[PDB]
Amino acid sequence: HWGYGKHNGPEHWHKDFPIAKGERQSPVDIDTHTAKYDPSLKPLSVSYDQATSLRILNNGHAFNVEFDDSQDKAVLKGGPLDGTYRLIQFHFHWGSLDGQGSEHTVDKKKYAAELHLVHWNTKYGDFGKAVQQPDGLAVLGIFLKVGSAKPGLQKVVDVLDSIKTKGKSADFTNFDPRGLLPESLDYWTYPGSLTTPPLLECVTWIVLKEPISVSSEQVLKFRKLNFNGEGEPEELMVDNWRPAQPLKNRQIKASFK
Ligand SMILES: [N]S(=O)(=O)[C][C][C][C][C][C]C123[B@@]45[B@]67[B@]89[C@@]1%10B81%11B698B746B814B562B%10%1143
Numbered sequence: 001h002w003g004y005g006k007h008n009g010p011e012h013w014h015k016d017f018p019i020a021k022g023e024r025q026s027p028v029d030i031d032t033h034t035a036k037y038d039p040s041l042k043p044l045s046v047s048y049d050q051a052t053s054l055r056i057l058n059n060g061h062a063f064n065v066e067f068d069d070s071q072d073k074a075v076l077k078g079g080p081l082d083g084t085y086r087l088i089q090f091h092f093h094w095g096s097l098d099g100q101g102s103e104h105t106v107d108k109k110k111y112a113a114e115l116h117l118v119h120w121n122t123k124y125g126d127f128g129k130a131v132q133q134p135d136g137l138a139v140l141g142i143f144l145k146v147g148s149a150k151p152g153l154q155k156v157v158d159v160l161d162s163i164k165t166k167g168k169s170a171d172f173t174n175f176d177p178r179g180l181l182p183e184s185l186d187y188w189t190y191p192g193s194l195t196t197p198p199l200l201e202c203v204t205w206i207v208l209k210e211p212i213s214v215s216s217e218q219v220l221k222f223r224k225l226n227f228n229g230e231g232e233p234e235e236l237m238v239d240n241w242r243p244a245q246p247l248k249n250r251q252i253k254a255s256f257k
């Protein structure tokens with residue numbers, strides 16, 4: 001099955017998922033000089049005050065913090081979006097070392113990690129229907145650099161020991177994702193895809209310019225997770241990022257001057 005190794009990594013995905021070589025694949029390099037300021041873009045509205053986290057899951061490729069998405073409790077709107085998008089989960093991508101780990105790059109710079117807050121368009125009723133639509137998902141991407149600790153991340157870090165291996169989950173209630181946001185909501189946006197199989201071309205990407213800082217100790221704990229299941233040969237969960245894909249016939253727009 002697909003993963004991040006020599007024999008099953010991103011360069012192989014196209015055999016099972018031919019859309020891997022499609023016209024709107026993610027991630028991409030953001031060339032900051034070429035991205036056009038678009039004065040028609042609105043401020044992003046991130047309304048997470050009523051967010052209800054439920055659980056954290058090691059799915060064998062990352063860990064997902066899952067939310068109750070059975071009502072409009074945690075929603076993204078505005079920015080480039082029409083309508084209302086409901087938070088379903090967040091997860092990260094990260095490296096074996098601090099010099100790599102992000103999926104998007106900024107003028108070819110790789111960050112240590114990248115947070116993806118995944119939301120689906122309520123007009124399609126459920127996540128599974130939304131991923132079949134070109135405007136089905138909105139993913140808010142946030143870069144992580146290593147420096148000062150992010151206090152709002154520590155609750156996530158401390159539960160990782162309990163979900164070391166693939167298929168393990170843990171109750172994860174009352175986690176506030178507002179504690180993962182940078183100060184500024186300045187962003188870039190473009191049309192793209194899921195960055196993992198099935199690589200569906202259903203995402204409006206919103207990538208924040210301002211990174212968050214996390215400590216070396218925090219990211220080291222991400223790197224103790226395992227891709228393998230319990231009792232299997234240990235394969236550290238590191239380098240679970242897809243590299244930048246061809247931009248093709250797309251424009252990246254900036255919300256800021
Ligand atoms: N890295 S990222 O932020 O671009 C991606 C996060 C998207 C979550 C989408 C995966 C699935 B799993 B369930 B439902 C969706 B349909 B079925 B299975 B298929 B896979 B696809």
Ligand SMILES: [Zn+2]
Nearest residue numbers: 092093116195
């Ligand atoms: Zn992701």
